[PDB]
């Protein structure tokens, strides 16, 4: 608050700031646009998928383990062990306030869970359009063919690639 910061609880000080025009209004509007922008930037970086996708209870992904990135239902917040590791490593009366974000950590985790489930179960088809179910071995075969590697390499070394991915 520009008014409370410069002239909190002083009528004469408020009268003097009224003589300077709208410098107070300009700085509040500037912080209003910044506060809107932050939520906006969160919106384009996170809400790029229309539907909330959820992984099936069957984890037969060709040996690929995703329990470290997929959310754990036991926790009240739907977050992963890795996400908890990231969240654990990150650390008044003068008119200054902190506005809460529009999307808090729970729906942020839900958006990331939807993106992860859609990616794992559909490749790029959920982003291109409707989500098309694809086996994960076939999806990685498409990815390997996308970089000039024949799919026989994956279909002969699936166990080795799964072990290296888990490691």
């Amino acid at each position: 608050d520009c008014t409370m910061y410069i002239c909190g609880d002083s009528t004469e000080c408020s009268n003097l700031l009224l003589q300077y025009g709208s410098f107070c209004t300009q700085l509040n509007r500037a912080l209003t646009g910044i506060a809107v922008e932050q939520d906006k930037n969160t919106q384009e970086v996170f809400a790029q998928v229309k539907q909330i996708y959820k992984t099936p209870p069957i984890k037969d992904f060709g040996g690929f383990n995703f329990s470290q990135i997929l959310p754990d239902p036991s926790k009240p917040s739907k977050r992963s062990f890795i996400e908890d590791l990231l969240f654990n490593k990150v650390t008044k009366f003068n008119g200054l306030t902190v506005l809460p974000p529009l999307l808090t950590d729970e729906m942020i985790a839900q958006y990331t869970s939807a993106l992860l489930a859609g990616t794992i179960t559909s490749g790029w088809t959920f982003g291109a359009g409707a989500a098309l179910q694809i086996p994960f071995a076939m999806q990685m075969a498409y990815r390997f063919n996308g970089i000039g590697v024949t799919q026989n390499v994956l279909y002969e070394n699936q166990k080795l690639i799964a072990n290296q991915f888990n490691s």
């Binding site: 608050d1 008014t3 409370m4 509040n28 209003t32």
Partner: protein, 97 residues
């Protein structure tokens, strides 16, 4: 706040809610001693210019309206503080030359 007679759909911050006080609390230590300003102003003899006296005054209460209502003073210019808002304040130490 928007300086317009038409408001578009959305949220707008307009004012600041404040709780207004209703009770006035003025507290000072209840010293009943009369201040020796009268001895300083009404001394029989004053010292020299270079050997200017300095009276330290403590633990007293002074009203300062005696300095106002007396018209004998041909020079009264207070510099760092307003002398009219003096009885509502309290200070650590006061020195009278």
């Amino acid at each position: 706040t928007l300086k317009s007679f038409t408001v578009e759909k959305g949220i707008y911050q307009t004012s600041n809610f404040r709780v207004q006080p209703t009770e006035s609390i003025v507290r000072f230590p209840n010293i009943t001693n009369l201040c020796p300003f009268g001895e300083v102003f009404n001394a029989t003899r004053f010292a020299s210019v270079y050997a200017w006296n300095r009276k330290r005054i403590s633990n007293c209460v002074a009203d300062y309206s005696v300095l106002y209502n007396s018209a004998s003073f041909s020079t009264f210019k207070c510099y760092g503080v307003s002398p009219t808002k003096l009885n509502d304040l309290c200070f650590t130490n006061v020195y009278a030359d």
